[PDB]
């Protein structure tokens, strides 16, 4: 935000701190002394920003962050480790960028209790009704790869999935329940799509206000003698919204069932999305001007250069901390 306030009438606007315009840049018409992309680095800045944002953005709801340091808070690390189960390593693409992930399950205790009750019922039903062969080891391996081991047999449906970045293990995010999931059997690729609202906090707070108003009205009526959906409500503020889509690759057959079971009934979210699409304000698509004039944009160029220098200076320490 503290970036230099661009001089009036520049042929670009500063979007996310960088020079961009809605229309495709016409350098040849607009620039007399264009600095090279090497000189500008705008492309570099954009790429670093993109990757970092993908590491830290709002795409998935955050749920756990490593606490910024005989404090017992150390003892909670193994507890948080055990509250999730450990699962195998998978690749993700974010726009032009790609990332890698290991998978972790969030232990739904109701599924554990119901599994114990189901085993009780099945046992009671059964009681009421009443060298070594390596090929068998290969069969067991394949069965455990496409059928389910005990932890997978309990967590088939309603299991909870946590995402973590293998290049940034500090943050954990929820897999979107309000998402469309397609499992490509031929390519082993999974595409996830969801709509995201930039002022969602505004909508949630107005939703809370409406809930309070309805509760007050019900209390007033009671003094004499609910699937509240903010997106349906006529007084909901305009969502600034974006539709998003992402592809996963590298997930194995057994995990697909867990994932496929985990997401919400499709028609309901489809109708919700259609409402969002009527009421939403779509994010406008714009084009970055990677080339800047060395004379009119000298301040902007140097500012970008300085910020890049600081970013790189910090980035070395990140691995030096490992």
């Amino acid at each position: 935000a503290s970036r230099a306030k661009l001089a009036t009438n520049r042929p670009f606007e500063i979007v996310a701190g960088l020079p961009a315009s809605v229309e495709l840049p016409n350098y040849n018409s607009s620039l007399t002394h264009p600095q090279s992309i090497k000189n500008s680095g705008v492309l570099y800045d954009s790429l670093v920003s993109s990757r970092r944002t993908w590491v830290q953005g709002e795409m998935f709801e955050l749920y756990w962050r490593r606490p910024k340091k005989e404090s017992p808070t150390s003892g909670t690390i193994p507890l948080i480790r055990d509250k999730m189960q450990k699962m195998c390593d998978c690749v993700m693409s974010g726009g032009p960028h790609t990332f890698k992930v290991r998978l972790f399950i969030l232990k739904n205790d109701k599924i554990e209790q119901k599994w114990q009750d189901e085993q009780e019922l099945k046992k009671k039903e059964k009681e009421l009704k009443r060298p070594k062969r390596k090929r068998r080891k290969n069969a067991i391996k394949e069965d455990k790869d496409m059928q389910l081991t005990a932890f997978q047999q309990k967590y088939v449906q309603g299991a909870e999935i946590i995402l973590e970045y293998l290049e940034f293990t500090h943050s954990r995010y929820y897999l979107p329940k309000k998402s469309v999931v397609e499992f490509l059997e031929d390519t082993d690729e999974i595409i996830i799509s969801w709509i995201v609202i930039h002022n969602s906090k505004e909508i949630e707070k107005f939703k809370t206000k409406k809930i309070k108003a309805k509760l007050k009205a019900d209390q007033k009526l009671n003094k004499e003698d609910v699937s509240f959906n903010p997106l349906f409500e006529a007084d909901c503020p305009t969502p600034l919204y974006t539709p998003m889509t992402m592809k996963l690759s590298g997930i194995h057959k057994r995990f697909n069932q867990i994932i496929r079971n985990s997401v919400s009934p499709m028609e309901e979210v489809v109708k919700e999305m259609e409402k969002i699409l009527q009421i939403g304000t779509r994010l406008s698509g714009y084009n970055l001007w990677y080339q800047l004039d060395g004379y009119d944009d000298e301040a902007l160029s140097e500012s970008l250069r300085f910020e890049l220098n600081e970013w790189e200076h910090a980035m070395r320490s990140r691995r030096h901390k490992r």
Partner: protein, 40 residues
């Protein structure tokens, strides 16, 4: 010498295309030395 061939390429009161403007910028860029303060 090659610029003279380039000069003959220049528009001659016809219907010529934008690509000339690239050469124009090439000549314009020659105006002064580039005061690039900090190397990228």
């Amino acid at each position: 010498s090659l610029d003279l061939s380039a000069l003959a390429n220049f528009p001659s009161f016809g219907e010529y295309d934008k690509k000339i403007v690239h050469q124009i910028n090439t000549e314009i860029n020659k105006d002064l030395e580039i005061k690039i303060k900090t190397q990228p």
